[PDB]
Amino acid sequence: RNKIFISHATPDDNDFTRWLALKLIGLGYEVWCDILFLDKGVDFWSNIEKVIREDTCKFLLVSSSYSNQREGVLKELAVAAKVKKQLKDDKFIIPLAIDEQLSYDDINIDIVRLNAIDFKMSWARGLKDILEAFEKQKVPKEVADASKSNLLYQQIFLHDKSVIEKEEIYDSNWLSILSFPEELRFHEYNWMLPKRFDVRELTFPAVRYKNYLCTFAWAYDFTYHLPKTETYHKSKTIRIPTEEILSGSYDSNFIRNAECKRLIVQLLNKAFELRMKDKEVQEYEMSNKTAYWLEKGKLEKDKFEKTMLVGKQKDKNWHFAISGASKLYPFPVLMISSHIFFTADGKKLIDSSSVQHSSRRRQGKNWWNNTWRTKLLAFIKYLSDDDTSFYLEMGSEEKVFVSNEPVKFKGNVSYNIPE
Amino acid sequence: RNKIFISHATPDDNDFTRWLALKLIGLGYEVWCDILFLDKGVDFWSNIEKVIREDTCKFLLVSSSYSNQREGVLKELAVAAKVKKQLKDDKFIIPLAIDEQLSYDDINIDIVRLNAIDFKMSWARGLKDILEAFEKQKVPKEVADASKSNLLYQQIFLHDKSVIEKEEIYDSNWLSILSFPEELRFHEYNWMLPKRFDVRELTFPAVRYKNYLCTFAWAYDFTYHLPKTETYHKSKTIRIPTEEILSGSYDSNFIRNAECKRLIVQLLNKAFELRMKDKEVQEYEMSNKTAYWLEKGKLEKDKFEKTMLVGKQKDKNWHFAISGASKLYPFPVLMISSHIFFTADGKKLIDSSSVQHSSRRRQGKNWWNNTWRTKLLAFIKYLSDDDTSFYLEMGSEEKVFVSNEPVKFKGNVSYNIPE
Amino acid sequence: MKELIYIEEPKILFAHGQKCTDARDGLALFGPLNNLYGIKSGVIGTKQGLKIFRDYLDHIQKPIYNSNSITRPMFPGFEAVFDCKWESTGITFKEVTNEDIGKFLYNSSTHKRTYDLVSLFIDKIISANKNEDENVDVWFVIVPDEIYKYCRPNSVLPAETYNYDAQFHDQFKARLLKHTIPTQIFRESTLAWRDFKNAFGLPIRDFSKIEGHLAWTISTAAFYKAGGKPWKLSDVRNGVCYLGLVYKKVEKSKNPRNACCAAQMFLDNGDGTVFKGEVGPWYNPKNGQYHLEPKEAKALLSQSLQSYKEQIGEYPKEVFIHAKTRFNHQEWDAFLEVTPKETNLVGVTISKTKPLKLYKTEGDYTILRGNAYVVNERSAFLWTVGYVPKIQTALSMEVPNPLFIEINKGEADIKQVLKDILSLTKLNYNACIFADGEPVTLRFADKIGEILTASTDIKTPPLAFKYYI
Amino acid sequence: MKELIYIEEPKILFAHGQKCTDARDGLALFGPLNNLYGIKSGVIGTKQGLKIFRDYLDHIQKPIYNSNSITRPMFPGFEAVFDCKWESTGITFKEVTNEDIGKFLYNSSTHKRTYDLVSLFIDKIISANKNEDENVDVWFVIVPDEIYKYCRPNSVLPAETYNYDAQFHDQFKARLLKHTIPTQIFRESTLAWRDFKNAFGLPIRDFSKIEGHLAWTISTAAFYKAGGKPWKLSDVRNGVCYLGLVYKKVEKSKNPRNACCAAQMFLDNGDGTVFKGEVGPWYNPKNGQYHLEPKEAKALLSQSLQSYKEQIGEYPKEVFIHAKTRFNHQEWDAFLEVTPKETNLVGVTISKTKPLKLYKTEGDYTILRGNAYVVNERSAFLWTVGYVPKIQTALSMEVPNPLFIEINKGEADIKQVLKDILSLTKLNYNACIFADGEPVTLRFADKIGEILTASTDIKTPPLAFKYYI
RNA sequence: UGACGGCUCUAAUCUAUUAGU
DNA sequence: CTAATAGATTAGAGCCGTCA
RNA sequence: UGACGGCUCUAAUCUAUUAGU
DNA sequence: CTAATAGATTAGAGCCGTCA
Ligand SMILES: [Mg+2]
Ligand SMILES: [Mg+2]
């Protein structure tokens, strides 16, 4: 014998039956059950009868609402009754009542006069009672070892729960910067430009630094705002190459690597802002940064390459937006993040932070990875100019190019996505 | 047929059923009941019927508000009645009532003509009742243990042991005062006696008080130490009868009823000291009081009326000693305190506190009530004067009589002295 | 001829509502009132002490049998009696190196060495209570016998350290009041009595025939200190709260002065016994004046009345003041000024000084435990110690002294006061005996006072008793 | 086209020397390491709260099923899992009359009413601990909803006591620090979420399918506060000490006086795990500077090193000081000055505000849990939140962000640092979840920082985590 | 101090009175 | 205020048996 | 505050420069 | 010392969803 049969309502009583099987195996009891094994097929009933008749010592029946009046369960009950009659064993079938709804009045006739082990109140009490009954009846057993139960858990519970050594491809939000100008400029206007001219109003990016103006533009560029510009010699311009200041190989008492890199980042940010302003795209003011969004109906049927960017929710319209930041670490990038904004009808914004935040929280519940990926890629591809690039004007002839496809990452380990 | 059946209402009376079953198992009986013996996976009705019918010498029924009107209890009662009829044993079913809320006029119809055992007052009383019934009915007891089951049986039968009603006579260590002198007096010596004569060293008991001397002696007494006393008018005295002093009556500006019951006590103590000095009895100085004891051999073979007062213990001789204190509350009495002193050679004491304490502690182990009582009585009888009285000298003629037998107390409750 | 009256014994209330007169059988039959799940023991001391403690815990699992069953009941095992678990598996150890103990007891000054030992022992307990994660129910300190013999008031070896009484136990229990940690102190000889011997091949203390009583005592002590209630009084009259006062001299604090501490008992709603102290010494600058100024007496009565009012909600119907001193008119006039009109104050005095003795005629055993002699309406002799028929022996040797009960103030019946004083002798939780010789209100107050006056002033001391005894 | 590597699951050790990858499965299959015998609970509040807790206890005694047996594992019962009893029979109850709450929550000033309510609870808790003979292990507080709603800092009602925070929970835990009493707080609405609704006939919070998760969390928290050790890490290498530092502001003070707190973890040489907060609040008077002055840094490092030395016996071979901010040069020099010879000092910074997301193009499920991107020898991007193959779901809803781990100071291997940071996230005891987004050393310290900041009177605060979570 | 009891030794204090303060 | 004579109270310390 | 996640609205500080010191 | 302009750091709050 040396084996203990367990029957249940597959798959309604998986929890208790599987827990009891693992527990009993962990204590050194040989337990035979259906869901425990994985291989199945036509030859699944002859083995049941042979095991019950030949090498089964105790029959435990998980009697619940589902397990009662079950054809397979009743067949197992009949076979167990025959085996019990043959073996002259008074105690061979043991009911285990795990359902509170299953009253003792409406139980099956095959088990109506038998003393049942109750599990409704506390499962540990029932486990202790089963152990005591097995000990009193001298059920054969081995030494208690939880290693067998752990092995069964590892090899059955986690069969299709492992990890797959499959290569994959990842899209990101990192856009690489392709082109840079040749040199940087610190035009020297010795008390030539107005003291408080507000140089952040010029048609080209510029930053004040000592008495110098830093810009990628030409020496005589932006002369419309500075009429007193032509009478200026070329020798008074400090030209610094871009490659060395991006590589950190230019240290001067005039300026160090840190401040020059900071100025380059500032110029990139201002150029991005001005260029996006040129595209005629609506603006949104966040807590610290600024976002850009399209109106409703700006595109053809509110779609671009079969991907919708503007939509209707209840009595408002929702707009997808992207925000960019010019950063030089680890490699020159223009990092991109996503946001959602809400307007009354698609043309005018609603002046309420709480409403916007609550609406975004409600909207983002049902969106998944594919939705964000498609929207981000579509809005990035909207901006690009000719085939693969997007240019920012840093001067009369200088341009900075950003690619429209994000940087990919290659990984070697993935999953089997089992629904 | 050596198994006792217990019927109850599961789970309303689990506690008492388990308690009685455990007690009976510890006693040595074989007990079958539901909760204690509930096999799992067996036909319970057939097993219960087989147990009741084949091997059952007694049927202990538990009757209460819960077990009354129960299907299983009634069925077991019916089968037990059938077994009783088939066995011809009129004491087969034994009711046990454990509920104070169950009236005797609402009992089951099957146990109305049966002698029940009341467990209401205490489970111990009912347990002893049922054990007495079993012993009378010759219930087979399976004695498989020695010095443990017998000790369990002997543990009970003793908690219910109590006192019995019988008058007893106790002795005491108080000696009643029989009589007092009629008058106490304050002799007026107007700065006649020396200012520091130290009056306590003369023959008769006297106490200084203001310019007066208080003593029971006559006016012209104690002239051997105060010769300049004869020339003294006898009308210069204040006399208050002592009977009204020991009545809470006399009060005056000269002396308050309080200082009175202190002066008389002091005079009694001084008289006792002088009297015990006159009897040629050796003395010991304790921490606060003074003790008196007899030398070795001064009695006939150290015995007075078949009682021994001086003995031998290894390298020491032990002497019985008494100390006296006169008290007026509640009634004039002399209190005698017992001590045991130790001498090296029977004539010289030891000037070491530690050895005296150790010797007394060693001597106190063996004595019992009779030894102490006999020794005190013999000592007092030796101190007696004529037949039953003993006098203390207060002056020329006046005397105080005290009995030589301690005050006898009588009681109404005693014990059988069960060896 | 005079007559002696008799009073029966007030039995107690064990589990299942059962009642019995003796504590041993009362626990052995029905079990304790509350049911603990198990006792986790923490041990502080050396390695030899931990080994001995584990050996004793293992030994007290199996039944232990006494020499005479009638006089002393058997010990049938801790789990069988108290229905809880106490095994040598939840034992948690903190080692104290023998080097530290040896080096600290070398200053030849009792105050400094006692201070050092107490600080060493209590720092580890405080650290293990505030910083570690485990749970400790009762801390069992195991002190070596070589330090116990030297931590005594008058002991000679063959800095805020002078402000404490030169006793290890008193100061140890006094310094841990602000952290609320139970503690049980063992001497190495108390447990391993067979190993410690003398010049002859016999142990100094012989537990061969009294081993069962030792097991019962340690078992009940550990049960109470872990949060158990072994028993309670069967009958307590309603509306009545009982007090007990003890005076203790504050030795060597800038002057010879004295303080007072109290304990109290009453029956609260739910048939429970509120057995709790009344803390906070009340001094008086006069030396040798075992009395209280009116200001301190009014505070004491107000505090007791408010403490009873909080739990019950009604002012007590009757208040009893057990004490071993005598009241004067000044402090009793200080009383009765905060006492409610629906309240009667009885000031009762209990003492064991007056030397009366009774010998049975033509016998060998002593007088019974229930006998009492009533001299007047305001005086009585009660024999709280004597022969008990149930155990077929007496509770003491020779002839015990009678206990004097004198109603010093108030009007009441002598029988009822004697009955209450007899009943207040069945509440010795520290022991497992038939009854105690003096009321617990006059002994537990003394135990409190011995501890509160062995340290500096501490605000709002704990009122529970498991932190003191 | 960069390259990513994979990091394997940490293993969390369980009873009988068996290992698993989920805390819930190991708890429900095998059992905990230590075996607590029982839990005694104390309930404070109105009769409604007592009934609520009794009903909840009776409910949690039986298995509760969630929506999906694979997504969120089941709850096979409190006693069937933890091998201990926590039921509604050992409850000790203390009432608070509703008039007291009404008379207190009318002042309209948050500080005064917060202080008054915290006092109204803690005074009764302390009095019950002090003046009662029972043994209460964990004290549960059923906070009424109306008390909770208005005790927030920036909430409105539609000098002596001003040295305190404006939060009920923080101050309530703060003023109980010196009495060493574990405390658990439950919202009245959380325990009985069904009876509290809105003007729609539906519960405000829907716990229908997630009662199993709630039961797991509450049972684990109650077990941990009661002195249990559920699970420990598997392969922590010997001789490594992790020490996290967290900075905080202070509500009221003459200066901002930024406060520093610390938390410590290492191996106990007994195959265990020591995880305790080594915190004595250090102060910086300079405004806006999140770097400690050299004296404070010396004190912190000396205290941590001394604690490690006393716990084991020798100095550590490796110290990773996790912090959320970069360090300046002078602080690192001060750390170096108090450092032993053979002791490697490493300063690592973990940050979250770094815009970078990775999208899976094929499916609709997020990235694997254990992936990692190595930028250089001194920095990396580590993933911890996302899809796990064992639980068949993602730890978050949207596309999660990874963590940026930087080896700011010293020499260390980036892969080993990432492995340790990932393995540290399986020891959050305040909830029973598969994984978290932040390591525990920089998390629990945060909680300490928000407890001993609400009050300034605490000296030598407790270290064990059972009084802070 | 694992409990209890019984003995022994010291030291204040109150009261009455007496003498120098 | 100091010092002796007592009665009448109160508090501390120190030591030994517990069975046959 | 039984958890965890992701958002929006706010404040100091450091560096660089200019002008009020 | 204060007041504008940028980057790159940090910390406090409050709000919504967790299933189908
Ligand atoms: Mg004790
Ligand atoms: Mg918490």
Q: Which domains does chain D have, with CATH numbers?
A: 34-225 (3.40.50), 233-467 (3.30.420.10)
Partner-chain contact A173 D3, CB within 8 Å: no
From chain C, pick out residues whose CB is under 8 angstroms from the CB of B365. 397
State the distance from the centre of ligand 2 to the C-alpha of B353, rounded, in angstroms. Answer: 67
C247 assigned binding-site residue: no
- Nearest CA distance, D23 vs chain A (angstrom): 14
Residues 90-149 of D with CB under 7 A from strand G: 148
Partner-chain contact D367 A408, CB within 8 Å: no
Proximity of residue D447 CB to strand G below 7 A = no
Partner-chain contact D37 C85, CB within 8 Å: yes
Which nucleotide lies nearest residue D68, CA to C1'?
Answer: H19
DSSP H or E run through A127? helix A123-136
From chain C, pick out residues whose CB is under 8 angstroms from the CB of B156. 25
State the distance from the centre of ligand 2 to the C-alpha of D430, rounded, in angstroms. Answer: 7
D-A interface (Cβ pairs under 8 Å ≥ 3): yes
* Beta bridge partner(s), residue B118: B97
Which nucleotide lies nearest residue C141, CA to C1'?
Answer: E1
Q: Which residue is nearest to nucleotide F16 (CA to C1')?
A: B361
Partner-chain contact C464 D132, CB within 8 Å: yes
Cβ proximity of C273 and C265 under 8 Å: yes
What's the rounded Cα separation, in Å, for the pair A165 and C107?
Answer: 73
From chain D, pick out residues whose CB is under 8 angstroms from the CB of C232. none
- Neighbours of C, requiring at least 3 CB pairs below 8 Å, are B, D
Resolution (A): 3.5
Of D4, D77, D399, the CB nearest to A372: D399
Nearest alpha-carbon partner for A370 in D359, D396, D395: D359
The helix-helix angle for C168-175 and C441-452 (nearest 10°) equals 80
Tokens coding D348: 């690592």
Tokens coding C420: 């209450």
From chain B, pick out residues whose CB is under 8 angstroms from the CB of A113. 43-46
Nearest alpha-carbon partner for D61 in C227, B287, C109, A121: A121
The count of other CB atoms within 10 Å of the CB of residue A22 is 22
Pairs of residues, one from chain A and one from chain B, whose beta carbons lie less than 8 Å apart: 35
Tokens coding C89: 């598996």
What's the rounded Cα separation, in Å, for the pair A342 and A357?
Answer: 9
Partner-chain contact C6 B162, CB within 8 Å: no
State the distance from the centre of ligand 2 to the C-alpha of D120, rounded, in angstroms. Answer: 20
Which of A159, A170, A173, A366 to mutate to probe the D interface, most D CBs <10 Å?
A170
Q: What's the length of chain A?
A: 419
D121 contacts: CB under 8 Å, gap ≥ 6: D44, D96, D141, D172
**DSSP alpha helices (H): ranges in C362-440?**
414-423
Of A91, A129, A130, the CB nearest to B42: A91
| C-alpha dihedral sign at B170, B174, B175, B176 | negative
What's the rounded Cα separation, in Å, for the pair D29 and A71?
Answer: 31
State the distance from the centre of ligand 1 to the C-alpha of C183, rounded, in angstroms. Answer: 9
The alpha carbon of B367 is separated from its chain's Cα centroid by a whole number of angstroms, namely: 17
From chain D, pick out residues whose CB is under 8 angstroms from the CB of A22. 29
Cβ proximity of A126 and A104 under 8 Å: no
Q: Which residue is nearest to nucleotide G14 (CA to C1')?
A: D289
What's the rounded Cα separation, in Å, for the pair B41 and A111?
Answer: 10
What's the rounded Cα separation, in Å, for the pair B236 and B99?
Answer: 86
Question: Which method, experimentally, gave rise to this model?
Answer: cryo-EM
Restricting to A residues 208-247, those with a Cβ less than 8 Å away from any Cβ of B are none
Nearest alpha-carbon partner for A396 in A232, A270, A217, A182: A217
Cβ proximity of B171 and B404 under 8 Å: no
The alpha carbon of C209 is separated from its chain's Cα centroid by a whole number of angstroms, namely: 25
- Residues with CB under 5 Å of ion ligand 2 are D 469
Cβ proximity of A320 and A305 under 8 Å: no
Nearest alpha-carbon partner for A33 in A47, D76, A145: A47
CA A370 / C1′ H18 distance in Å: 21
Beta strands (DSSP E) in D74-194 are 92-94, 138-143, 183-187
A324 contacts: CB under 8 Å, gap ≥ 6: A175, A272, A334, A335, A336, A337
A259 assigned binding-site residue: no
Identity at B255, one-letter amino acid code: I
From chain C, pick out residues whose CB is under 8 angstroms from the CB of D132. 464
What's the rounded Cα separation, in Å, for the pair A91 and C446?
Answer: 66
Which nucleotide lies nearest residue C258, CA to C1'?
Answer: F11
Instruction: Inform me whether the C-beta atom of residue C18 falls under 8 Å from chain B C-beta atoms.
Output: yes
Cβ proximity of D185 and D144 under 8 Å: no
Cβ proximity of B282 and B293 under 8 Å: yes
Residue with tokens 């420990």: D232
CA C349 / C1′ F4 distance in Å: 34
- 3-state SS track over A316-362: EEEEEEEEEEEECCCCCEEEEEEEEEEECCCCCECCCHHHHHHHHHH
DSSP string, D376-412: SSSEEEE--SSEETTTTEESSSSPPP-EEEEEEES--
C316 contacts: CB under 8 Å, gap ≥ 6: C239, C240, C241, C266, C305, C308, C343
Ligand with minimal distance to D185 CA? 2
State the distance from the centre of ligand 1 to the C-alpha of C424, rounded, in angstroms. Answer: 19
What's the rounded Cα separation, in Å, for the pair A72 and A54?
Answer: 19
Tokens coding A184: 């940087």
- Nearest CA distance, B161 vs chain C (angstrom): 6
Q: 3-state class of A363 per DSSP?
A: helix
Neighbour-count burial for A162-177, b at 16+ CB within 10 Å, e otherwise: ebeeeebebbbbbbeb
DSSP string, B257-322: HHHHHHHHHHHHHHHHHHHHHHTT-EEEE-SSSEEEEPPTTSSGGGBSSS-B-EEEETTEEEEEEE
Annotation: binding site of B for NAD(+): 7-8, 10, 34, 45, 70, 72, 76, 104, 114-116
The angle at the Cα of C241, spanning C239 to C243, to the nearest 5 degrees, equals 165
Proximity of residue C218 CB to strand E below 7 A = yes
B-D interface (Cβ pairs under 8 Å ≥ 3): no
Neighbour-count burial for D107-130, b at 16+ CB within 10 Å, e otherwise: eeebbebbbbbbebbbeebbebbb
